[PDB]
């Protein structure tokens, strides 16, 4: 009814969602060329600033992970601003591949902190000048939010486009229940939805380095 | 631009099938319009 | 190639294979990219028609929904 | 299995053997995760 | 190999010029009009184009995309210009750079 | 509006100029000033300043120490004891005097001698990280 | 602004009592090439032509629908 | 049914979660504003901060609104 | 309250601290005149 | 209808939440002020992010309404 | 009547919402003490805009209000 | 009676908005210590601004106590 | 009874408006902190506005009890 | 039974009023954090004054707690 | 179901809790957009904090959905 | 049954408590960036006092849970 838009599409029998799922990369040409047109031009300036504003802070290994990083950081971009083109379906909004982008980076991050560095690893656990009467809960509270921040990123990004796109489309479908009935307030309210719309795109965008910004930060505490 | 004269034939095809097209509206709307108010009726 | 041919035996002479197809669409897309976007002093269109051609098959698979919000009934 | 190993295996090897080894046991626990999770249903 | 130096020429960003002369000669220039009008006339009128909340979203998009565009089109492409022009004179910079060295040696 | 007077004992570098914003480290944290600005004093710490001409350009200098004062009249005085441009500087011996100013550091015991040390060491880091 | 009219004038007009003879002679050639099946020698670039604008005397017919039911979005009833 | 009107009691108690982003925002805009006014040189860079804050606000603000749909449609 | 206030300093050695801080971070070209320039003579009696 | 109290009732607490929209422009217009205070040469820009600011307050108040109507009417 | 209770409770939980609109003007006229204690010199000018903080602060508070009353009375 | 019980409750809710008026309080007098003790000289001015932050305050949260009589003694 | 229920369930609520008092204090007694920490000469004087602040957070507090009891026994 | 149900709500309603104390406990160890660390000479007399300010926080926090049990037990 | 209701009206009142974390997230940002616009030259460091003290506010959030959930599936 | 459902309704409540202590580490820890981004020299000394801080502010929140659990399983 209200959820039209986020189930899992299919035309003609086939689950044509594979085929949106792989389509962003299709916007990004590379060439082996010196000079080249516009697009590849500033679509490589792009990469270039998105990878000197995040991996410029970590050591020399976690920029080994920067191949990672930055292509994480274009495809959901992509994807969310393709979500935005009508009638789309925004793979992000399902809880099952943010979870399959949370879980496995996460997961290999901690792994990777646990397996060397155990030490510190296991004493990040404890802030450095604790007094004693209060050490064992301040180990259970970290224990805890460690083991759920991938929980927290693939909500956060999940129900985030959800909510927005719902949202559109509700007041979509106000302004819809608004054309038979006084045409100065359908404007406002198509106004309104204008803005949005301009909100919505930023929110992509955000969300977007907001995810690869959280993934980030964990590999630089377990490096 | 210079202007193309359309050939006849599509020009006398395009305003006939407009007139068939009124008289196919204009004569569905009215074979339509006592259905609709009947099952319109007979719904409640 | 099409736009050239009249005859259907040149249906059967293409390479319907997986091989063949995949060749196809590279060929296409090559094509494309050539002609629109491989060029300096390029434009947006190269790309607003792709985004275009996209809004046409999303609204292809979610016309399955939408058909059910139709405002008439005929 | 040529053109295929040479432009996609080739350049990967060095981050699917060393690089992303924590990233394959992260992926095995998402499936059994993933697994679980279908199983109880 | 060097690059073409033009596009495709599309009209409003959507249909290729190919299409509007290869109309051409039927029905002259008008007739890709007629048949756009009359193919979004049919297919917002058989149903094949329902109207719906997607139909506001769209066109609030297509708003802002528009108006991107003819806002901030001239600036990103006179960038793409300018980071173009700037690595092809820093290399001519090197080009005859070395040469001024050996020359010396 | 702003009448700006950027001295040092030896050289007058700006006075009674129209600038547009001038950003100073102060010791109680760096901030700005542009015309209008709320009447205050501070003293320095060493770190670059950056002053805004109303074109557009600015020049980039470094200051040891000394006073900044912006009063009612928009008319800011700033004084430096030791106002370098960055040029005349290099990262080497910035280096290598922080290296020896941490190892007198961690040599020394005597308060008052160790924050004499620690002071070298803040003015020599403020060094380095201004340089480049 | 007023261009549209000036094209109208030429390819937009109730076509008049005098051209409708060659509109039948077409006629008769396109039969005569379905009856002899000579449509075989049309190249597909053409062809694809003539079907498109076919498909655009067909709209011709769909908008003359539209405006003689007086409803633009389905029947009303 | 009761179950349906615990639903609406229950949903309308998840959104009033929301008033802690509304706050959130407001605090992360208003130090914005003031950050600025003291070193406006670095405008951009504090900026991009603002926006991970206000990033992180909505955060939970959303599953607030989550839990609040999670019951309304998907119990 | 700095640290070197709390350790019994004042302003002015802050000061002299710093500008051979920079005079010592001087390259060797401007080296010998800047220290000229602020070479102290005076002596306490 | 118990049907129709639950709409009143989890009207009335999704309109709860824009306590946070209040307390959100409060707080952007309060150091709009400060940091005018301190920088007037920039009102002008300051403005500026205080509107945005407010934007974004005013957002997440927005929706707690949203649902207070898309309950009271669509529900 | 269990529709006239439930606009009872409803218009009480739609007036919670004011509790935004008091903090919001707390909050604002303590940022103009300080702003007026810091630059006293703009003290005109600063009480304009902490009028318009206000004058948007109750606002939120109002459309409160209106939906207790629109209940109550219109509902 | 169902209505003597929503009243009761709508009374409760109705009353929680003083909240509002507490915090209200709370920052109005924080910031005029702040602000007194940056710029003593002014105090008796600044003192002023604070009463009338407080006469505005202490407002609202009388608009709320206002509905809980005017439901239980008035309805 | 629904009577004594309804009496329970008001009690509650009007006893969650103490949160702002408490809040109140809080920012009271910080400010104080903040405002020793810069003059303390004047410390004296400023424990003096402190109370008061302190004397009128409280006070919106009690109102809250007050309906609390004045349900619980008086109702 | 309904009462014991009842008593078991109001001792959440009233068990959320600690909230309060929380965010005041919150911005006090806020406060003496910068006091101290601008004056840092005064750290002493300044440590005092947050434990007195802890030592009401966490007063109003007790009422609610009070009533929480004064309603779970004594009735 | 009255428990099925029950069960929803406590998943949208745990809900409730997560406002903390929201304003928490906040004043955590608007701090660090503060600190940094005044000791710029530490902004890597300060960033560090900033995360950990966002990392234990959304802690204490997560425990109200904690109870959400473990009210709404596990019981 | 009804003492059940009571529970979990009021476990909800008491949990929504929590909100205090997140807003409470939020406030402590960007204090603590703010007064280390002043005067760094004293980082180790105050991160002593945030810990303190949080350590007290979780406290409160522990509360809460305590109930819950002390609820949930021991009633």
């Given at each position: 009814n209200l959820f039209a838009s986020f189930i899992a599409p299919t035309i003609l029998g086939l689950p044509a969602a594979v085929l949106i799922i792989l389509f962003?990369?299709?916007?990004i040409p590379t060439s082996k060329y010196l000079i080249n047109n516009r697009l590849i031009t500033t679509q490589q300036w792009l990469i270039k600033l998105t990878s000197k504003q995040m991996m410029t802070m970590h050591n020399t290994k976690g920029r080994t992970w920067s191949l990672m990083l930055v292509s994480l950081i274009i495809f959901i971009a992509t994807t969310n601003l393709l979500g935005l083109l009508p009638h789309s379906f925004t793979p992000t909004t399902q809880l099952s591949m943010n979870l399959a982008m949370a879980i496995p980076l996460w997961a290999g991050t901690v792994i990777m902190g646990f397996r060397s560095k155990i030490k510190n690893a296991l004493a990040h656990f404890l802030p450095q000048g604790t007094p004693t009467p209060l050490i064992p809960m301040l180990v259970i509270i970290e224990t805890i939010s460690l083991l759920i921040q991938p929980m927290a990123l693939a909500v956060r990004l999940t129900a985030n486009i959800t909510a927005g796109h719902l949202l559109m489309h509700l007041i979509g479908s106000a302004t819809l229940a608004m054309s038979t009935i006084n045409l100065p307030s359908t404007l406002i309210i198509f106004t309104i939805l204008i803005l949005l719309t301009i909100l919505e795109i930023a929110v992509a965008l955000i969300q977007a380095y907001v995810f690869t910004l959280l993934v980030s930060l964990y590999l630089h505490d377990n490096t | 631009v210079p202007p193309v004269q359309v050939s006849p034939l599509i020009k006398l095809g395009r305003y006939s099938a407009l007139f068939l097209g009124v008289a196919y509206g204009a004569t569905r709307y009215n074979y339509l319009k006592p259905r609709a108010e009947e099952e319109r009726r007979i719904a409640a | 190639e099409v736009k050239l041919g009249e005859l259907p035996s040149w249906i059967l002479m293409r390479d319907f294979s997986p091989s063949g197809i995949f060749g196809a669409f590279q060929r296409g897309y090559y094509r494309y990219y050539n002609k629109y976007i491989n060029v300096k002093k390029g434009s947006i269109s190269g790309i607003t028609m792709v985004l275009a051609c996209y809004v046409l098959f999303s609204y292809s698979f979610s016309y399955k929904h939408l058909k059910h919000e139709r405002l008439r009934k005929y | 299995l040529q053109s295929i190993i040479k432009n996609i295996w080739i350049p990967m090897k060095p981050y699917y053997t060393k690089v992303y080894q924590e990233i394959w046991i992260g992926m095995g626990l998402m499936g059994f995760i993933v697994y679980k999770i279908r199983a109880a249903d | 190999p060097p690059l073409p130096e033009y596009g495709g020429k599309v009209r409003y960003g959507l249909i290729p010029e190919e299409f509007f002369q290869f109309l051409?000669?039927?029905?002259?220039?008008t007739g890709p009009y007629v048949l756009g009008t009359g193919l979004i006339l049919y297919a917002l009128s058989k149903e094949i184009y329902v109207i719906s909340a997607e139909t506001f979203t769209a066109l609030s998009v297509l708003g802002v995309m528009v108006y991107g565009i003819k806002k901030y089109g001239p600036f990103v492409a006179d960038f793409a210009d300018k980071l173009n022009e700037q690595k092809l004179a820093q290399l001519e910079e090197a080009k005859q750079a070395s040469i001024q060295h050996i020359q010396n040696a | 509006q702003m009448s700006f007077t950027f001295a040092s004992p030896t050289q007058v570098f700006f006075n009674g100029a129209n600038v547009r914003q001038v950003d100073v480290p102060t010791l109680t944290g760096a901030f700005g000033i542009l015309a209008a600005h709320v009447p205050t004093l501070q003293v320095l710490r060493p770190g670059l300043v950056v002053v805004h001409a109303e074109d557009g350009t600015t020049s980039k200098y470094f200051v040891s120490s000394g006073s900044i004062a912006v009063n009612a009249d928009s008319s800011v005085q700033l004084l430096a004891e030791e106002a370098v441009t960055?040029?005349?500087?290099?990262?080497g011996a910035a280096k290598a005097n922080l290296e020896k100013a941490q190892a007198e550091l961690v040599g020394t015991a005597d308060e008052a001698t160790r924050a004499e040390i620690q002071i070298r060491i803040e003015a020599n880091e403020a060094l380095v990280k201004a340089l480049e | 602004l007023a261009t549209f009219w000036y094209y109208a004038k030429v390819e937009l007009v109730?076509?008049?009592?005098?051209e409708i003879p060659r509109a039948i002679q077409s006629l008769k050639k396109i039969v005569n090439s379905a009856q002899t099946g000579?449509?075989?020698?049309?190249?597909?670039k053409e062809a694809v032509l003539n079907g498109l604008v076919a498909t655009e005397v067909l709209m011709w017919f769909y908008v003359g629908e539209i405006i003689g039911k007086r409803g633009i979005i389905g029947y009303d009833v | 049914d009761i179950d349906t009107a615990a639903k609406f009691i229950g949903a309308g108690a998840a959104t009033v979660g929301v008033a802690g982003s509304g706050a959130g925002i407001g605090t992360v805009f208003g130090s914005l504003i003031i950050g600025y006014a003291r070193n406006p040189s670095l405008k951009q860079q504090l900026f991009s901060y603002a926006i991970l804050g206000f990033a992180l606000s909505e955060a939970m603000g959303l599953f607030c609104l989550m839990v609040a749909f999670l019951i309304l449609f998907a119990m | 309250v700095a640290y070197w206030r709390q350790a019994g300093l004042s302003y002015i050695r802050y000061s002299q601290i710093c500008a051979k801080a920079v005079r010592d971070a001087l390259k060797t070209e401007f080296k010998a005149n800047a220290e000229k320039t602020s070479g102290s003579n005076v002596k306490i009696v």
């Amino acid at each position: 009814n209200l959820f039209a838009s986020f189930i899992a599409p299919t035309i003609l029998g086939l689950p044509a969602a594979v085929l949106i799922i792989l389509f962003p990369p299709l916007l990004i040409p590379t060439s082996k060329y010196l000079i080249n047109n516009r697009l590849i031009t500033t679509q490589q300036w792009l990469i270039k600033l998105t990878s000197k504003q995040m991996m410029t802070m970590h050591n020399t290994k976690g920029r080994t992970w920067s191949l990672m990083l930055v292509s994480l950081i274009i495809f959901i971009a992509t994807t969310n601003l393709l979500g935005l083109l009508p009638h789309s379906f925004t793979p992000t909004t399902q809880l099952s591949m943010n979870l399959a982008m949370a879980i496995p980076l996460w997961a290999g991050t901690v792994i990777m902190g646990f397996r060397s560095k155990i030490k510190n690893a296991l004493a990040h656990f404890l802030p450095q000048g604790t007094p004693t009467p209060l050490i064992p809960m301040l180990v259970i509270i970290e224990t805890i939010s460690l083991l759920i921040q991938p929980m927290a990123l693939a909500v956060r990004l999940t129900a985030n486009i959800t909510a927005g796109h719902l949202l559109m489309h509700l007041i979509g479908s106000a302004t819809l229940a608004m054309s038979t009935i006084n045409l100065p307030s359908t404007l406002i309210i198509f106004t309104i939805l204008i803005l949005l719309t301009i909100l919505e795109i930023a929110v992509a965008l955000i969300q977007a380095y907001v995810f690869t910004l959280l993934v980030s930060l964990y590999l630089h505490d377990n490096t | 631009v210079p202007p193309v004269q359309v050939s006849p034939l599509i020009k006398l095809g395009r305003y006939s099938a407009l007139f068939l097209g009124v008289a196919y509206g204009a004569t569905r709307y009215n074979y339509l319009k006592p259905r609709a108010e009947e099952e319109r009726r007979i719904a409640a | 190639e099409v736009k050239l041919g009249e005859l259907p035996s040149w249906i059967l002479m293409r390479d319907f294979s997986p091989s063949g197809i995949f060749g196809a669409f590279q060929r296409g897309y090559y094509r494309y990219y050539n002609k629109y976007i491989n060029v300096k002093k390029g434009s947006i269109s190269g790309i607003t028609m792709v985004l275009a051609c996209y809004v046409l098959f999303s609204y292809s698979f979610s016309y399955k929904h939408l058909k059910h919000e139709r405002l008439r009934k005929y | 299995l040529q053109s295929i190993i040479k432009n996609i295996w080739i350049p990967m090897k060095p981050y699917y053997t060393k690089v992303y080894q924590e990233i394959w046991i992260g992926m095995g626990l998402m499936g059994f995760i993933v697994y679980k999770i279908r199983a109880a249903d | 190999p060097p690059l073409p130096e033009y596009g495709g020429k599309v009209r409003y960003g959507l249909i290729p010029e190919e299409f509007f002369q290869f109309l051409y000669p039927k029905t002259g220039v008008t007739g890709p009009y007629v048949l756009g009008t009359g193919l979004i006339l049919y297919a917002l009128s058989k149903e094949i184009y329902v109207i719906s909340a997607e139909t506001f979203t769209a066109l609030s998009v297509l708003g802002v995309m528009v108006y991107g565009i003819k806002k901030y089109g001239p600036f990103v492409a006179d960038f793409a210009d300018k980071l173009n022009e700037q690595k092809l004179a820093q290399l001519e910079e090197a080009k005859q750079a070395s040469i001024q060295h050996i020359q010396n040696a | 509006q702003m009448s700006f007077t950027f001295a040092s004992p030896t050289q007058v570098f700006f006075n009674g100029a129209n600038v547009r914003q001038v950003d100073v480290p102060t010791l109680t944290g760096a901030f700005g000033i542009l015309a209008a600005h709320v009447p205050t004093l501070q003293v320095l710490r060493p770190g670059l300043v950056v002053v805004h001409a109303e074109d557009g350009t600015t020049s980039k200098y470094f200051v040891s120490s000394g006073s900044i004062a912006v009063n009612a009249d928009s008319s800011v005085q700033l004084l430096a004891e030791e106002a370098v441009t960055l040029d005349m500087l290099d990262l080497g011996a910035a280096k290598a005097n922080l290296e020896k100013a941490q190892a007198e550091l961690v040599g020394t015991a005597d308060e008052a001698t160790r924050a004499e040390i620690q002071i070298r060491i803040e003015a020599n880091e403020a060094l380095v990280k201004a340089l480049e | 602004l007023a261009t549209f009219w000036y094209y109208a004038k030429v390819e937009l007009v109730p076509p008049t009592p005098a051209e409708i003879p060659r509109a039948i002679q077409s006629l008769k050639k396109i039969v005569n090439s379905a009856q002899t099946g000579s449509f075989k020698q049309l190249t597909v670039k053409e062809a694809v032509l003539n079907g498109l604008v076919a498909t655009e005397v067909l709209m011709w017919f769909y908008v003359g629908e539209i405006i003689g039911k007086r409803g633009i979005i389905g029947y009303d009833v | 049914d009761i179950d349906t009107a615990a639903k609406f009691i229950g949903a309308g108690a998840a959104t009033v979660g929301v008033a802690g982003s509304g706050a959130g925002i407001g605090t992360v805009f208003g130090s914005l504003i003031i950050g600025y006014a003291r070193n406006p040189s670095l405008k951009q860079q504090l900026f991009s901060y603002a926006i991970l804050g206000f990033a992180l606000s909505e955060a939970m603000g959303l599953f607030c609104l989550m839990v609040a749909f999670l019951i309304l449609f998907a119990m | 309250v700095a640290y070197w206030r709390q350790a019994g300093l004042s302003y002015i050695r802050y000061s002299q601290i710093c500008a051979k801080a920079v005079r010592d971070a001087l390259k060797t070209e401007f080296k010998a005149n800047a220290e000229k320039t602020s070479g102290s003579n005076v002596k306490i009696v």
